[PDB]
Amino acid sequence: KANLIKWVSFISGDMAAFGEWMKGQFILLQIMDWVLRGAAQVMFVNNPLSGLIIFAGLILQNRWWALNGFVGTVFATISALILCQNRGAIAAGLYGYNGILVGLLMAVFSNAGDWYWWLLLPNIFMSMACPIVSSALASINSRWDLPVFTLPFNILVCLHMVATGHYNQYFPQILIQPTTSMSNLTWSELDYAQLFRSIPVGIGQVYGCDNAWTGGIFMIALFISSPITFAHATIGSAVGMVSGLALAAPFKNIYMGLWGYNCVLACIAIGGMFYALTWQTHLLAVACAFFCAYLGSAIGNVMSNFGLPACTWPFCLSALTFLLITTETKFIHKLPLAKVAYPEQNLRYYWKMKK
Amino acid sequence: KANLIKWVSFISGDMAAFGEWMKGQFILLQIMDWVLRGAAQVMFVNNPLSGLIIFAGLILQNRWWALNGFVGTVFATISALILCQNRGAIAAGLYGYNGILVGLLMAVFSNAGDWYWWLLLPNIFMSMACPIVSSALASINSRWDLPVFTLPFNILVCLHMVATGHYNQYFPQILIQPTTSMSNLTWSELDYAQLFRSIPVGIGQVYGCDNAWTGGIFMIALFISSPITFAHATIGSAVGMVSGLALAAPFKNIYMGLWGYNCVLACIAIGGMFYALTWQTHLLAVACAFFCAYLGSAIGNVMSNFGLPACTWPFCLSALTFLLITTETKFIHKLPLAKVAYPEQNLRYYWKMKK
Amino acid sequence: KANLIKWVSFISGDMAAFGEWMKGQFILLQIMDWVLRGAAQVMFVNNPLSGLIIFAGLILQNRWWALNGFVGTVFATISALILCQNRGAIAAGLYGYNGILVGLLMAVFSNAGDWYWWLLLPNIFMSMACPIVSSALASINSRWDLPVFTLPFNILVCLHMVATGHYNQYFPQILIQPTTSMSNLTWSELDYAQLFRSIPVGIGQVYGCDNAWTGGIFMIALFISSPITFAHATIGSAVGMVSGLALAAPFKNIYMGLWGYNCVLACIAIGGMFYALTWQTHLLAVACAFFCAYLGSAIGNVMSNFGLPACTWPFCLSALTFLLITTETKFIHKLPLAKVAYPEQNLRYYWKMKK
Numbered sequence A, B, C: 001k002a003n004l005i006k007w008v009s010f011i012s013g014d015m016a017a018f019g020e021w022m023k024g025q026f027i028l029l030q031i032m033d034w035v036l037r038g039a040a041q042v043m044f045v046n047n048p049l050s051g052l053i054i055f056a057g058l059i060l061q062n063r064w065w066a067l068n069g070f071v072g073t074v075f076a077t078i079s080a081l082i083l084c085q086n087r088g089a090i091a092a093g094l095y096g097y098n099g100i101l102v103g104l105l106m107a108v109f110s111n112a113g114d115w116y117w118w119l120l121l122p123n124i125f126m127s128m129a130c131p132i133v134s135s136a137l138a139s140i141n142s143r144w145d146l147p148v149f150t151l152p153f154n155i156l157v158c159l160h161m162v163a164t165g166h167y168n169q170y171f172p173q174i175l176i177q178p179t180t181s182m183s184n185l186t187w188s189e190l191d192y193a194q195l196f197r198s199i200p201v202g203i204g205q206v207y208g209c210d211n212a213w214t215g216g217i218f219m220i221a222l223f224i225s226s227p228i229t230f231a232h233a234t235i236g237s238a239v240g241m242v243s244g245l246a247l248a249a250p251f252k253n254i255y256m257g258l259w260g261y262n263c264v265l266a267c268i269a270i271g272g273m274f275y276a277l278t279w280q281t282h283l284l285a286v287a288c289a290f291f292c293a294y295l296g297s298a299i300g301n302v303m304s305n306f307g308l309p310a311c312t313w314p315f316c317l318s319a320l321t322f323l324l325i326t327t328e329t330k331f332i333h334k335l336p337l338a339k340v341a342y343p344e345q346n347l348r349y350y351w352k353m354k355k
């Protein structure tokens, strides 16, 4: 009984005990810990165990994608080290999540086929640029006390697959053409099992995986760390589903969760992560999730002309917008960046402050 | 004699006496006053009477457009209230003009036809987002002491009609395709009555109305409040006309005032409104109006690829550029934002300061 | 012997002795000096003699292009004077390089043919807007202590040739269509003389000249002022060549140096000019040059949809990114803007500081 509770407290949330021990151990095993934490940080989670769960999901989805993600995040961490960035930040996985996203989405969008080893070569360079660009953004955004927010990934993944494009002999990408025909959406044709399955599929799309089992694995990883993040994740994916229904989105897109990943990320960040969890904050999170869906439709349409995907551009632009709003209410409380942690610590910090 | 003068002083400029009385009256009538002030604030005018004049013009142009504008501005005001934004700002109509523009231009660009009630549903949401985005912009721009400048509207109206597009089953928009053929502009074909009628048509296009009578109504509303704003309005529309002639613009576009609304807004703001009215400031306003026309040609061409209109993107980007320039002359005086009012108060404040 | 050394010291680097004398002489000859310094400032060089060398190269390439460049830079200087901008900045050519680039590239991209005198009319206006926009950018960027970096030129040249476009009756521009066919790049077809000749051709493309002799003239102008700038120039052009090979770029583009001008500018700025010259800084400069090539491929592809060129947008966005990165190493030292001069003075200032 007490043992199970102690174990639950230990694998929950940022592993403070595990993090304090790691400093002592060997450098390579530390690097592995930082890579795992960064792999979990896409979901705003600082849990190495959730990182192993995430990598299990990625291995389940596609082994080439998992390899690209691993090499991307490890080289992002190494580049953060060689540039002498803050090791508190590297050890918290704040520089590796951009790398894993870069690797995963270059694997996803590459038309060269599975096990195209040359794709590692840009995967390294874009990952090495994940720290640089991150710092370049942090400086601009630290003025308003806003986080970096996956913006580096976006710039890099787009910068790659607009520089190469579909008609590139070395690194071809998938053809993304803008919609030039009216779509006959039939409500009778809609399938509800797939619609309600879009929640895990959206949680999976956060990493680029379209498999529902991978999304369930991701939710398990979230619930190991923070139940608030899990709740806001499901709510964000549901908001994306409903919004896609409301904007006459093609059904196959809602089924594949392409309307959910931006919304889930927005709901995590604007819920517990940067704003103190209050009912006002939770409704702000749902509103930010709805806005984010519009951004996904918009940024998807505006970037389909360039042959580019809309990838996390929507979240950043929504979460940044909702983190910049100034109100006269003391219930929509914006946390300082250093103090920010998983939503439970944020809630405890908020409550102590008020007392 | 003295009575007419007193009445003129009272309906002129920000109605200080009317504003001080309103605080006392009932909440709903206050909301109506704030809605009317916001409707007049597109023209940078804080006059409720000019707001009634503007709504008369909108009713004259299209009753569906007027209804969408009214619902948009009322919901922008309500959203500003529920988010606990400054009531000095809401009472000055600084949160409702974006809403009325959103409603009007969604009505204008919707291909679903007149009296498409479902268009109210996005008209509400984009209007509710007018405060949020406004604050999101204000924070960034308050650092340089600049105004939001209708940027929220732009983001929202574009975000809508790039998310939906022409090929959307629920909210179709008009097809805006980029120019793919050379145009044979004939100077002999030019009609001068329509060219010189483009001044009121441009003042109308500020709100989306292409009717010359509506533009005359708008000028009457301006002259009730501030003659300087009226003069700069006519000058801006004329600058847009001349520039459109100078850039080989199609004649039908100049006739319909599509070259004037950005220029008139730029000339109002860079003339009396944010810069103290000096001959140097007035020439800066004319130069900003000319720049703005180039932006309209440019932003129109760059956004026609996305199927989007260029709507007020040009003004903001010009007025912001001309408000950021630093000179060593004390005659190009940039006013602080709180002190800014209608150009007559700005001139009086400037002159007192110098004395 | 001592005489040759004294002369070398005098035509080297910012001509401090010549600059101090000029203040005394007549206003028109001063204006000529400032125009020449601005013509040399595209290469980050404050040497009037290098300005004469640059204008000799431009006259060699195309006399229409040279005339447009001269009129653009002279009107940029005049506009900087009439707006009462800092004469320390005007006398250093910090306001004329944007003008010469605007004139040169409007001449380059105009489809109206050689000696189209009407092209002078926009060449004047865009040049007159070079100071305004410059100040508009400086204010934003002085907060982070970064330079304007030729961003004004970019905005203006693009703003022109997106406002006019290929199908414009008065100011037609060249057709730039996005790639819609796969290219069969053959390594056997590659010619090495042209590949290695791409270094001077890239240095020429910095000003828009595709002639190798003009590039050699430009390198001579650089070596008169600062050998470090010459070394970083050749290294940047070589990096652009190698990157273009690495991204499957068409061979004719690498031969014409279209992959080098952004890289050479990035390597100059991130090498000696704004960062103190250290081996860490030099590797940062090479990395910034490689990033810049990706930007050129990307910004070229993203802007080819609009019918626009990618012109120096890549450099600014790379140099700005690499100037915003914050590290914990004291060897990547960012110089303050006022202190910045040619790389030799930067190195001497750095070394004195450390002592």
Ligand SMILES: CC(=O)Nc1ccc(NC(=O)c2ccc(C(C)=O)o2)cc1
Pocket (backbone or CB within 6 Å): A041, A042, A043, A044, A094, A097, A142, A147, A148, A149, A150, A265, A337, A338, A340
């Ligand atoms: C002192 C300081 O600035 N600390 C600080 C800086 C940045 C962040 N941001 C994140 O952890 C983060 C942002 C976005 C994301 C994802 C995966 O979307 O993850 C937290 C704290």
Ligand SMILES: CC(=O)Nc1ccc(NC(=O)c2ccc(C(C)=O)o2)cc1
Pocket (backbone or CB within 6 Å): A101, A105, A176, A177, A205, A206, A207, A208, A209, A258, A261, A300, A304, A309, A310, A311, A312
């Ligand atoms: C016709 C068309 O627009 N297709 C299309 C649109 C958008 C995307 N984007 C994604 O699938 C995606 C998955 C995961 C991500 C992330 C989190 O970066 O981004 C692919 C294809």
Ligand SMILES: CC(=O)Nc1ccc(NC(=O)c2ccc(C(C)=O)o2)cc1
Pocket (backbone or CB within 6 Å): B041, B042, B043, B044, B094, B097, B142, B147, B148, B149, B150, B265, B337, B338, B340
């Ligand atoms: C303390 C403070 O920031 N006050 C303050 C803030 C914002 C504004 N801006 C406006 O009224 C405004 C800007 C643009 C427009 C339109 C319709 O174009 O109208 C004035 C004063």
Ligand SMILES: CC(=O)Nc1ccc(NC(=O)c2ccc(C(C)=O)o2)cc1
Pocket (backbone or CB within 6 Å): B101, B105, B176, B177, B205, B206, B207, B208, B209, B258, B261, B300, B304, B309, B310, B311, B312
């Ligand atoms: C082929 C093409 O580009 N057509 C095209 C271009 C631009 C517009 N924009 C407007 O009409 C407009 C009117 C009023 C407004 C405002 C103030 O927001 O914006 C429509 C159609």
Ligand SMILES: CC(=O)Nc1ccc(NC(=O)c2ccc(C(C)=O)o2)cc1
Pocket (backbone or CB within 6 Å): C041, C042, C043, C044, C094, C097, C142, C147, C148, C149, C150, C265, C337, C338, C340
């Ligand atoms: C006090 C202060 O801000 N000084 C200051 C301001 C701006 C610059 N920038 C340049 O000289 C410059 C930037 C970019 C370029 C080119 C041709 O690319 O040339 C230096 C010093």
Ligand SMILES: CC(=O)Nc1ccc(NC(=O)c2ccc(C(C)=O)o2)cc1
Pocket (backbone or CB within 6 Å): C101, C105, C176, C177, C205, C206, C207, C208, C209, C258, C261, C300, C304, C309, C310, C311, C312
């Ligand atoms: C199909 C296509 O993309 N063509 C294409 C692409 C890019 C350019 N840009 C330039 O040539 C250029 C030369 C010099 C400059 C500068 C320094 O401003 O910019 C032309 C044509």
